[PDB]
Amino acid sequence: KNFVISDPRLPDNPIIFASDSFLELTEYSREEILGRNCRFLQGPETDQATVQKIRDAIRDQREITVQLINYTKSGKKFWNLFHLQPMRDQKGELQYFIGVQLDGEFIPNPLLGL
Ligand SMILES: Cc1cc2nc3c(=O)[nH]c(=O)nc-3n(C[C@H](O)[C@H](O)[C@H](O)COP(=O)(O)O)c2cc1C
């Protein structure tokens, strides 16, 4: 499983954990991504309209699934089916965000443009 956990109580909602698979996919070592917002995976061909939907889902604390282009450390592109989910503690208070990444062009690109 490719996934990261971020802490929205810390400035700029930084990564506090990244799985081994996520590091292999993105070509980053854990030390150079901890404490950073996961936006470093976006690049020139990333649809900003899709990024806007992630921004709203984090604001409203809703789960969302989108497909978008991301970049590995060396600049290699990959399609990312991205599922974001809020994690709440026993008191029903927002505690973490978990983002799961599935690499592949699952939804055909010409259908996604609609
Ligand atoms: C847990 C978590 C995982 C995320 N994973 C990705 C990702 O894999 N790819 C991506 O493009 N954005 C991902 N994001 C979204 C960015 O981190 C960021 O929230 C988005 O770009 C909007 O924020 P910004 O406008 O300040 O950059 C993730 C966000 C969270 C909270």
Author numbering: 389 to 502
What does the literature reporting this entry say, word for word?
Phototropins are higher plant blue-light photoreceptors which regulate the response to excessive- or low-light levels, leading to, for instance, phototropism or chloro­plast movement, through two distinct light, oxygen or voltage-sensing (LOV) domains, LOV1 and LOV2. LOV domains, which belong to the larger Per–Arnt–Sim (PAS) family of small-molecule binding receptors, non-covalently bind the blue-light absorbing chromophore flavin mononucleotide (FMN). Under blue-light illumination, a covalent bond is formed between FMN and a nearby cysteine residue within microseconds, constituting a photoadduct. The formation of the photoadduct is associated with structural changes in the LOV1 and LOV2 domains, most notably the unfolding of the C-terminal helix of LOV2, Jα, which leads to the activation of a serine/threonine kinase domain.
Unexpectedly, we observed that, after a time corresponding to twice the relaxation time constant, the space group of the crystals changed from P43212 to P212121, suggesting that the in crystallo relaxation of the photoadduct population leads to a phase transition. In addition to this expected result, we observed an unanticipated phase transition, which occurs 70 to 80 s after the release of the PS equilibrium. This phase transition consists of the loss of a crystal symmetry element, which corresponds to the transition of the asymmetric unit from a monomer in the tetragonal space group P43212 to a dimer in the orthorhombic space group P212121. The non-crystallographic dimer is obtained from a crystallographic dimer whose molecules have slid apart. After the phase transition, the continuation of the ordering of the C-termini develops asymmetrically into distinct conformations and at different rates. While monomer A continues to fold in the α-helical conformation, which is completed within 130 s, monomer B refolds at a slower rate into a very different, hook-shaped conformation, which appears to be fully completed only after 1620 s. The difference in C-terminus conformation is coupled to the orientation of the side chain of a nearby bulky residue, W467, which rotates by ∼90° in order to accommodate the hook-shaped conformation of the C-terminus. Most importantly, we observe that residue W467, which belongs to a well conserved FWN sequence of residues found in LOV domains, acts as a gate discriminating between the two conformations of the C-terminus. The loss of this salt bridge may drive the sliding motion associated with the phase transition. In brief, we observed the appearance of a symmetry-breaking phenomenon during the in crystallo relaxation of the LOV2 photoadduct.
